[PDB]
């Protein structure tokens, strides 16, 4: 219905366009050639998913983690906040350091900083710009940046534009490789050995595309062991941690009581807090470093009053406890899904054959908590088929593929929200087990499964 | 207020001395901050002295006084009220489930008001320029850009896939002609029309206040690129709302919406909120959605953020900013006649004591802009700022790194909500400073400090 109208528009947008641009001007000629590169691998993005916004599909893909957007709970606290300041000055006035600072944004920052256990906060338009500012301002020449290989794109963009000359990745969440990265970096840099420069460790609290948790206590112990002079500093991107983890959604850093051990923390408002923006946490020296050396911040207009107001409304819902029930239902529904798919008859054969792989679902009971992020892996030549199977079953997931991940690591990303139900989770489990069945029967018989046939049929027409 | 200047005075006291047993990371961080303090140009809280009412606003970016009057606020809240059940959260990135009908419809309203085929909305003008210059240039293309394009344009070009980036002297048609032709003559794939030259300009330049001669550069581009293998990119941050009928900006005013492939219009200035739109055909828009990785990997704008942009443009389309816009023109022409009619103007400008280049031949233009950069001698620049501030006139001082080392100045912004009496006081204050400086220099005492600097140097001693 509405599922099939967007599949058609998606199929149609991958038709190569350059063979029609021979007469077009050179500028548009080469742009449509560049778009054709993506079309050729069927990865041209246009209008997104959105079948869940209309009711035509379950929402297992959006970032509305606590359903604050779905319920209108944030909108009502947002309008209530604007009503506490009639005649508010909407316009900031300019750059935050030249005409754009005002009392209400400083007060909201300190309010948030107090709630998350930090000394100071600085507000950005987004988590991305938060990362851009951190890694263009904070790293000094002679510093070293050691980062998890799956840090966010904005972190990669910030580090590339950094003043630091030494940046070394380490294998994802691997405490051994992080040790090897730390000590091999120390040994070859005499300025780190005598403590005249620092090593900056860059990690995410919860990884957007894997769903696992940074072992921060252990990394901090490794760091102190390698750098006994204390010349290290951590930077924790809690994008997918805020609102999900910790008492009243404070995140992983405060949950572990590391608020004095992690020098820089980024908390974003784009997921659980159901709006946009971010704050960078640190002491007053970090904050003044961003205001003075993060040129991206210096040359952009400061947040408007409504933008600050929606952020404050979201932390209000967190800090007054209004999100606590939604926060536990995530834990419940993720465990409920984990129990249900690992208890179905076919999970064992499908896991050996490699038909389905959900690594976050294994050993889940030994963790202090679970995450909302559940990537589901299949065979790489089955990935689009798994997507079409769920999509045609009226379950909206996010497909992950090149360029978003390396060209061989394709997967499906399922998001469990506080506003989902056990009936919907049962439907997701049953839907996945039908797919695992279909591919095992094909593997035991060149057949193409039902769902893919229908999508390939629509292509043969469009 | 004395308090804002006192706080600024304290923020310049060096701190590296107290940092010994301070850990390496905070010591090196505060050592970098000291580099700014030792030149007295550390920034902390800005210039908000005007915001309360204790100083005249000649500094903010609220050009049409939409923020001051609450006009945009009232329309913004009525727009929210006409959508009582709006979905606040976008859902994710614009290409992954953050798209919705409201933002697309708003985009097309802005495109059609601006005379463009499509529009694409960003969090900021800076993010728009980032997206343009990382997504649009192809390998083999050349970028010819005005040296004074915005910081975000410089960041975007440095992350670009184009391998020839050529700057040219600001607003200079001969320098631009020389950049275009020497770039054309050294690239066989520009000569044969298979790659393109991208031309990057601001319609109104944020710190010199002058206007890009866009019709002249298009003529020169077509001359040097007879195959038409070129494309212009016009950043209109300081034109939207303030230039053209009903604020449509410079490109539409000259009727060049079909000759300028990419346009950036921003909401941080005269439109009194935040955000931007990139304008172009659907090939440009798809290019940004697929190759601007900054856009792909960030959350899509929430409903209230879209609605205030809509309210701003709706104000412009109902003609509710035209009188504010005519007021700007009146007040800037009034400042220009006033200051150049002053007694000391001839002497102060011959001596380089005062210099306002946008005040020269302002009558030979079709319009003026709101940006009045005021120069003095480089060693007097903070003295000029102190003098203006203590006279309760809020201006924004402009020093390294915002500008080159020896190009420090002070930026006055004329807003619609300003008055002729406020302009009279500014001129009187400027003439006092010029007179005080001419006296000090002819008195032959190289240690003589002006009055307003004496007070600042006093508080520095006390505090
Ligand atoms: C930061 C205050 C400011 N910005 C100027 C500016 C921007 C940034 O746009 P945005 O703030 O990211 O929406 C973009 N392009 C031009 C030409 C500009 O002059 C100013 O001139 O005081
Ligand atoms: C919206 C795309 C997305 N994640 C965003 C994200 C950001 C950017 O945050 P912002 O949208 O600029 O505020 C920063 N750090 C991490 C770890 C992230 O995962 C996702 O997983 O769908």
Coordinates of N, CA and C and ligand atoms in Angstrom, one line a residue, chain A residues 94-95 98 125 297-302, chain B residues 61 123-127 129 150 152 202 204-206 235-238 264 266-269 274-276 411 413, ligand 1:
Chain A
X94 N 23.7 36.6 17.5 CA 24.9 36.4 16.7 C 25.7 35.2 17.2
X95 N 27.0 35.2 16.9 CA 27.9 34.2 17.5 C 27.9 34.2 19.0
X98 N 30.3 36.7 20.3 CA 30.3 38.1 19.8 C 28.8 38.5 19.5
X125 N 24.5 23.2 18.2 CA 23.3 22.9 17.4 C 23.1 21.4 17.2
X297 N 32.3 26.8 16.0 CA 31.4 27.5 16.9 C 31.6 29.0 16.8
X298 N 32.8 29.5 16.6 CA 33.0 30.9 16.6 C 32.3 31.6 15.5
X299 N 32.1 30.9 14.4 CA 31.5 31.5 13.2 C 30.1 31.0 12.8
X300 N 29.4 30.7 13.9 CA 28.0 30.3 13.6 C 27.1 31.0 14.7
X301 N 25.8 31.2 14.3 CA 24.9 31.9 15.1 C 24.5 31.1 16.3
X302 N 24.4 31.7 17.5 CA 24.1 31.0 18.7 C 22.7 30.5 18.7
Chain B
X61 N 23.1 41.0 15.2 CA 22.8 40.6 13.8 C 21.2 40.6 13.6
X123 N 20.7 23.0 9.7 CA 20.7 23.6 11.0 C 21.3 25.0 11.0
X124 N 22.2 25.3 10.0 CA 22.9 26.6 10.1 C 23.4 26.9 8.7
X125 N 23.7 28.2 8.5 CA 24.4 28.5 7.2 C 25.8 27.9 7.1
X126 N 26.5 27.7 8.3 CA 27.8 27.1 8.3 C 27.6 25.6 7.8
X127 N 26.7 24.9 8.3 CA 26.4 23.5 7.9 C 26.1 23.5 6.4
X129 N 27.2 25.5 4.0 CA 28.4 25.7 3.2 C 29.3 24.4 3.3
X150 N 33.3 32.9 3.7 CA 33.1 32.6 5.1 C 34.0 31.4 5.6
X152 N 33.2 28.8 7.1 CA 32.7 27.5 6.8 C 32.9 27.1 5.3
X202 N 30.2 35.6 -1.7 CA 29.2 36.2 -0.8 C 28.5 37.3 -1.5
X204 N 26.8 39.7 0.1 CA 27.1 40.8 1.0 C 28.1 40.2 2.0
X205 N 29.3 40.9 2.1 CA 30.4 40.4 2.8 C 30.4 40.8 4.3
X206 N 30.4 39.9 5.2 CA 30.0 40.0 6.6 C 30.9 41.0 7.3
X235 N 26.7 32.8 -1.5 CA 26.3 32.8 0.0 C 25.6 34.1 0.3
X236 N 24.3 34.1 0.6 CA 23.5 35.3 0.8 C 23.2 35.6 2.3
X237 N 24.1 35.2 3.2 CA 23.7 35.3 4.6 C 23.3 36.7 5.0
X238 N 24.0 37.7 4.5 CA 23.8 39.1 4.9 C 23.0 39.8 3.8
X264 N 22.9 29.9 -1.0 CA 22.7 29.7 0.4 C 22.1 30.9 1.0
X266 N 20.4 32.2 4.7 CA 20.5 31.9 6.1 C 19.5 32.7 6.9
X267 N 19.1 32.1 8.1 CA 18.1 32.7 8.9 C 18.7 33.2 10.2
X268 N 20.1 33.3 10.3 CA 20.7 33.8 11.5 C 20.8 35.3 11.7
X269 N 20.6 36.0 10.6 CA 20.7 37.5 10.6 C 19.4 38.2 10.6
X274 N 17.6 30.7 13.5 CA 18.7 29.9 13.0 C 18.3 29.0 11.9
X275 N 19.3 28.5 11.1 CA 19.0 27.6 10.0 C 19.5 28.3 8.7
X276 N 19.4 27.4 7.7 CA 19.7 27.9 6.3 C 18.9 27.0 5.3
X411 N 33.1 46.6 14.1 CA 31.9 46.4 13.2 C 30.7 47.0 13.8
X413 N 26.7 47.5 13.2 CA 25.5 47.0 12.5 C 24.4 48.0 12.7
Ligands
LIG1 C1 28.4 33.7 13.4 C2 27.8 35.1 13.2 C3 28.0 35.6 11.8 N1 28.0 34.7 10.8 C4 28.1 34.9 9.4 C5 28.0 34.1 8.3 C6 27.6 32.7 8.1 C7 27.3 31.7 9.3 O1 25.9 31.5 9.1 P1 25.3 30.6 10.4 O2 25.4 31.5 11.7 O3 26.1 29.2 10.6 O4 23.6 30.3 10.2 C8 27.6 32.2 6.9 N2 27.8 32.9 5.7 C9 28.2 34.3 5.8 C10 28.5 35.1 4.6 C11 28.3 34.9 7.0 O5 28.6 36.2 7.1 C12 28.3 37.0 11.6 O6 28.5 37.5 10.5 O7 28.3 37.8 12.8

